[PDB]
Design a protein around this nucleic acid. Structure first.
Ligand SMILES: [Cl-]
Ligand SMILES: [Zn+2]
Ligand SMILES: [Zn+2]
Ligand SMILES: [Zn+2]
Length: 121
DNA sequence: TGCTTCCCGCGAATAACG
DNA sequence: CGTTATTCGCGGGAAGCA
């Protein structure tokens, strides 16, 4: 297979047979394991690059379109990802967007065709 | 040390299946 | 199709890099 199981305190962990990383969720081990096997490939559809996780490709492709989905609700400035948004809000507004802050809005993705969560509309 | 990308629990969206 | 099985978007802390 691709893993073995470890059980401490009645709680189950799934361990990657290759690098021994531990996962609470089997789906996470599977997602991770592609890094080792390259069974599935996620090539960028704008350049040569190829990724081992679907989400790594998606975040990369947003860099190509230049879409700015993260918007600061205190001043209206928008950002390409959470990290730049969070960094802005902490440094400029001295506030933490963690928890449920209501300090930012994540717009739906319109520059790419990805799965759309209803809660963003 | 400030960008930049990675990581993984969680669960909504959707593909697979019967 | 209903139903369950799979995918992968998301937060936000960690790790990587120059
Ligand atoms: Cl935009
Ligand atoms: Zn591994
Ligand atoms: Zn690319
Ligand atoms: Zn702002």
């Amino acid at each position: 297979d691709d893993h073995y199981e470890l059980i401490v305190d009645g709680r189950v962990y799934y361990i990657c047979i290759v690098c021994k990383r531990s996962y609470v969720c089997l789906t996470s081990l599977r997602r991770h394991f592609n890094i080792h096997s390259w069974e599935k490939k996620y090539p960028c559809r704008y350049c040569e690059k190829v990724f081992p996780l679907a989400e790594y490709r998606t975040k990369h492709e947003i860099h190509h379109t230049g879409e700015r989905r993260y918007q600061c609700l205190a001043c209206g400035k928008s950002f390409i990802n959470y990290q730049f948004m969070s960094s802005h809000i902490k440094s400029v507004h001295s506030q933490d967007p963690s928890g449920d802050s209501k300090l930012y809005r994540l717009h739906p993705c319109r520059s790419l065709q990805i799965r759309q969560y209803a809660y963003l509309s």
